[PDB]
Amino acid sequence: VPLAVPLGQTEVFQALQRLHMTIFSQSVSPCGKFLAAGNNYGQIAIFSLSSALSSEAKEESKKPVVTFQAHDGPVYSMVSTDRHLLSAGDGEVKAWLWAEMLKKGCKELWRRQPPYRTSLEVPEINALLLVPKENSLILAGGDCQLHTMDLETGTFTRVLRGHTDYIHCLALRERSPEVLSGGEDGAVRLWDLRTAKEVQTIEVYKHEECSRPHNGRWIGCLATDSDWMVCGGGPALTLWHLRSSTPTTIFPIRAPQKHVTFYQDLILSAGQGRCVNQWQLSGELKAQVPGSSPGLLSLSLNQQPAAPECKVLTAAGNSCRVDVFTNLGYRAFSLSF
Amino acid sequence: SIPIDYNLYRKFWSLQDYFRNPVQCYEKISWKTFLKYSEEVLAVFKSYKLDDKMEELVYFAKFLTSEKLMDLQLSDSNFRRHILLQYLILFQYLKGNYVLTDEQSLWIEDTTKSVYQLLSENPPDGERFSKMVEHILNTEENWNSWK
Amino acid sequence: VDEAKALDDKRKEMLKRHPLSVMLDLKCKDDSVLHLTFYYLMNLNIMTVKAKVTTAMELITPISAGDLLSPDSVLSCLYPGDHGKKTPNPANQYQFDKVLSDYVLELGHPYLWVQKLGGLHFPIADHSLSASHMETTMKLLKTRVQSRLALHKQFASLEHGIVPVTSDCQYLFPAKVVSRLVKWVTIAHEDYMELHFTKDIVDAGLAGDTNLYYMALIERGTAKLQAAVVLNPGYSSIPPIFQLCLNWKGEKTNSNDDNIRAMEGEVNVCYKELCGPWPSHQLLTNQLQRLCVLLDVYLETESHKEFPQEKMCLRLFRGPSRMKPFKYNHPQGFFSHR
Amino acid sequence: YLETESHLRLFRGPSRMKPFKYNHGFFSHR
């Protein structure tokens, strides 16, 4: 079972870094062919996903084709555009080109840092929201404030102040409020971009159907179906009806859930457990597919045009490896960092 | 195109080639590949968990060794029944040179007790079918004792 | 010089020691000496070594010292690996196949560095092959004996529940500490692999046979922390690896908690902050003291109250994993996040 | 006055002032 024994100070240190690695973020290329994984140590790996899914595939094809140090602190969030890869690291966002990150140069385009309260902590950036219909980017983190940045020029337009503690996740549903934000304070807030005000607040811990005071009050994940909402984290995995703010159904699971998304007609979830949780919208546990990590922090559906062969579900968390699901009942393989 | 797990394809039909020639399961390296591939395939069978009134709502004679399908067969229960029955026929044949390691015999007994549990987990009448398989394999031992 | 002038019987005459042997001893700056006796096997073309570490004092040994200075396994892994077990040249393996560890304990260990000292090149003795390898191996022996004597002193102190910290390392830690070490007992390999919370070290390939396996137990009020420790014999060049299991409420282990994994990252991966001067043989005590500090932080900064929070952390959680502050800042004396 | 007397910052200003303002949870100067 111990196949590779390191036998050397550098290789023992590399085995210790791989053993203590956490993969926070995932991003996909504009084509389906590439994957990007953010690191505990501020590194970024680039995964040739089409080469891994090919018929000709080697054991060294499940390795980063380019990995590079990109931030001083951990990479908590990535997002991708038509041409760029935006990565939020220590307290600032860097931008990378997909054409140049495969080459030997690996230079950055810009480096933008939002204005702060000048406290001596240099707060994090937990969630990156890429807004269509206008070239914009929403920053959220330990400043407890939502910053809006233009993508063309590095100017910060709106600052939104509704939360008490820091923010974990953002959302988008293309209507009049159009922006959800959930945080450590325990309330999902709605942020109309035109008036730059808060229009609705849903406190999930106040409702006794959802409370669970043992884990605490923190909202880790949000999801939108433009009429519905899935809110999870500390309290419970709950299905809310927007414009009513009523808890419709509860998903009966013990472990706290760090990420949630809408599938075609399923609910995908992952958290402190080992497995990926597939729910039905009524509230019935359809499946639990075991992964290779003891806990998961990120899911990604690679639903991109011009590459139908790169249509997989990728999962990552408290490990140095990424589980790739070519089908939703079993893992096909795993990409080492 | 549709994304295809080629590794499960290659390991599964290499197991099929091992079923077609039962003499090959007496060397070292071929048996080790049989151990790895069979445990991986039975792990996939345990972890998929069909749990199927769908059948209440032209005959295919041979197996369809096609790269592109590979998932419509895993969603079926008859295909799983054919593969688990083929495992049980191979294990009943190996119980009848040509020596076996005691560790191999313990592995055969563990995998046999797992395959009977997997046949009990088929949704149409797994227990009755498992009892039928047990009685038929006992009578196959009685038939093989004659010839 | 008279013997030098010149089927168990075949095994004895095959493992025939040459009547002439060489004996070299070093004295270190700890009023202690290392004695090496090199023996030769003319039927195998392999030379071996017996070793003996002796100090000037009586050397009152503790219980958990054990295989530190035991002459079977002192010089086992000077270079990374080499195991002291297998013969280097495969021609001798084919010759012994035509016809061993008890004879290794009887005769000595056929290392690779010993045969490079002799001049034997295994893919006729050469002085040019012996030249640089001589100085490098003598420096490595001088570091190895000093490291084992320093570990002996540290273990003699750690069996009394006291973590020996030096006057130099005091800036690495805060002043007040509450958690203390109550048990330090060496365990066996199989006893290490029987533990449920050490599967990752074994599966990574770090729990080999040639290691020293220890169990530390650190407590506060109804709070018990089992820390399994792996040392490979290249200490002060390769750090000990720790695994943590906190039996405080239920069983908070590495698989169901992320702050346990954060403390393991603070001890194992960031070990170069804890190494001091050039003879950095104080690394294990610095890791144990930092792990005591981390247990204090994990118990005080947990939100609800059996343990009052006296830390000046100024922010309790950050990041997606809700991380506790585990980095210490000495000139202002406060805890930040990593 | 009793704890911060010498045998995040202890003194400032020409008069060497001790931190007496509370922040609801650390002490700064006025």
Alpha carbon distance B67, B8 (integer Å): 10
Pick from A55, A308, A311: which is nearest to B6 by CB? A55
B41–A contact, CB cutoff 8 A = no
Distances (CA, A) of A287 to A260, A267, A277, A337, B114: 15, 10, 6, 28, 21
Q: H helices of chain A, where?
A: 9-19, 49-52, 98-101
CB contact under 8 A, A216 and C80: no
Q: Hey, of A17, A18, A19, which one would you mutate to test binding to chain C, going by the most C CBs within 10 A of its CB?
A: A19
Give the tokens for residue D28. 């700064």
Answer yes or no: CATH 3.20.20.70 is held by domain A9-336.
no
Query: A35 burial class (0-12, 13-18, 19+ CB within 10 angstroms)?
Result: buried
- For D5, other C-beta atoms within 10 Å of its C-beta total 8
Experimental method reported for this structure: cryo-EM
Give the number of C-alpha atoms closer than 13 A to the C-alpha of residue C109, restricted to the C-beta side: 19
Whether residue B13 contacts residue B78, with contact meaning beta carbons closer than 8 Å, is answered with: no
Whether residue A210 contacts residue A226, with contact meaning beta carbons closer than 8 Å, is answered with: no
Give the tokens for residue B142. 């009685």
C308–A contact, CB cutoff 8 A = no
Alpha carbon distance C17, C277 (integer Å): 44
Please list every residue in chain C whose beta carbon sits closer than 8 Å to the beta carbon of residue A74. 319
B8–A contact, CB cutoff 8 A = yes
Q: How far is D8 from chain C (nearest CA, A)?
A: 6
Unique residue bearing structure tokens 């001890």 = C267
Pick from C204, C315, C317: which is nearest to A15 by CB? C204
Give the tokens for residue D18. 């001790």
Give the tokens for residue A75. 């990479």
Question: What are the sequence ranges of the domains in chain A?
Answer: 9-336
Torsion angles phi and psi, residue C128, rounded to 5: -70, -30
Q: Do chains D and C touch (3 or more CB pairs under 8 A)?
A: yes
Alpha carbon distance A214, B38 (integer Å): 44
Alpha carbon distance A192, A178 (integer Å): 6
Give the tokens for residue C175. 């002043």
Helices then strands, counting H and E runs in chain B, come out as: 5, 0
Chain A / chain B CB contacts < 8 angstroms:
39
Alpha carbon distance C64, A8 (integer Å): 26
Whether residue A170 contacts residue A141, with contact meaning beta carbons closer than 8 Å, is answered with: no
C4–D contact, CB cutoff 8 A = no
Residues 299-318 of C with CB under 8 A from D: 312, 314
Unique residue bearing structure tokens 């595939």 = A57
Which chains are within 8 Å of A by 3+ CB pairs? B, C
Helix (H, G, I), strand (E, B) or coil at B37: helix
CB contact under 8 A, B5 and A55: no
CB contact under 8 A, D26 and C314: yes
Alpha carbon distance A183, B46 (integer Å): 38
Helix axis angle, B29-48 relative to B78-94, nearest 10°?
150
Residue A203's nearest CA partner among A167, A234, A245, A259 is A245
Please list every residue in chain A whose beta carbon sits closer than 8 Å to the beta carbon of residue C255. 294
DSSP H or E segment with residue B134: helix B126-146
D22–C contact, CB cutoff 8 A = no
CB contact under 8 A, A287 and B49: yes
Q: Name the DSSP class of A180.
A: E
In the chain, the amino acid numbered C322 is R
Torsion angles phi and psi, residue C287, rounded to 5: -65, -40
Alpha carbon distance A279, B78 (integer Å): 26
Give the tokens for residue A188. 């999902």
Q: Give the pairing of strands A43-48 and A66-69.
A: antiparallel
CA triplet B30, B31, B32: central angle to 5 degrees? 90
Strand partners of residue C228: C215, C243
Distances (CA, A) of B67 to A135, A325, B3: 43, 17, 10
Q: Hey, of A1, A20, A23, which one would you mutate to test binding to chain C, going by the most C CBs within 10 A of its CB?
A: A20
Unique residue bearing structure tokens 């013997």 = C3
Which chains are within 8 Å of B by 3+ CB pairs? A
Helix (H, G, I), strand (E, B) or coil at A106: coil
Alpha carbon distance B32, B46 (integer Å): 21
DSSP H or E segment with residue B135: helix B126-146
Alpha carbon distance B92, B98 (integer Å): 15
Q: Hey, of B2, B6, B74, which one would you mutate to test binding to chain A, going by the most A CBs within 10 A of its CB?
A: B6
Please list every residue in chain C whose beta carbon sits closer than 8 Å to the beta carbon of residue A143. none
CB contact under 8 A, B7 and A55: no
Whether residue A206 contacts residue A197, with contact meaning beta carbons closer than 8 Å, is answered with: no
In the chain, the amino acid numbered A39 is N
Helix (H, G, I), strand (E, B) or coil at C144: helix
- For C49-109, give the DSSP string: EEEEEEESS-----TTTTTSS-TTSSSTTSSS---S-S-S-HHHHHHHH---HHHHHHH-B
Q: What is the 3-state secondary structure (H, E, C) of A295-310?
A: CEEEEEECCCCCCCCC
Which chains are within 8 Å of C by 3+ CB pairs? A, D
Chain C / chain D CB contacts < 8 angstroms:
5
Please list every residue in chain B whose beta carbon sits closer than 8 Å to the beta carbon of residue A308. 1-3
Query: A67 burial class (0-12, 13-18, 19+ CB within 10 angstroms)?
Result: middle
Which contacts (CB < 8 Å, 24+ apart) does range C323-326 have?
Answer: C323/C258, C323/C259, C323/C262, C324/C259, C324/C262, C324/C297, C324/C298, C325/C297, C325/C301, C326/C262, C326/C263, C326/C266, C326/C294, C326/C297
CB contact under 8 A, A4 and C319: no
Unique residue bearing structure tokens 């007040």 = C176
Torsion angles phi and psi, residue A330, rounded to 5: -160, 155
Whether residue C181 contacts residue C217, with contact meaning beta carbons closer than 8 Å, is answered with: yes
Query: What are the residues whose beta carbons fall under 8 Å from the beta carbon of A55, sequence distance 6 or more?
Result: B4, B6, B67
Strand partners of residue C48: C39
Distances (CA, A) of C338 to A45, A77, B51, C194, C328: 21, 17, 46, 33, 9
C331–A contact, CB cutoff 8 A = no
D8–C contact, CB cutoff 8 A = yes
Q: Name the DSSP class of D17.
A: B
Give the tokens for residue A259. 């990420």
C146–A contact, CB cutoff 8 A = no
Pick from A308, A312, A332: which is nearest to B1 by CB? A308
Q: Do chains B and C touch (3 or more CB pairs under 8 A)?
A: no
For chain C, report the end-to-end CA distance as a whole number of angstroms. 67
Strand partners of residue C108: none
Q: Name the DSSP class of A73.
A: S
Residues 71-90 of C with CB under 8 A from A: 80-81
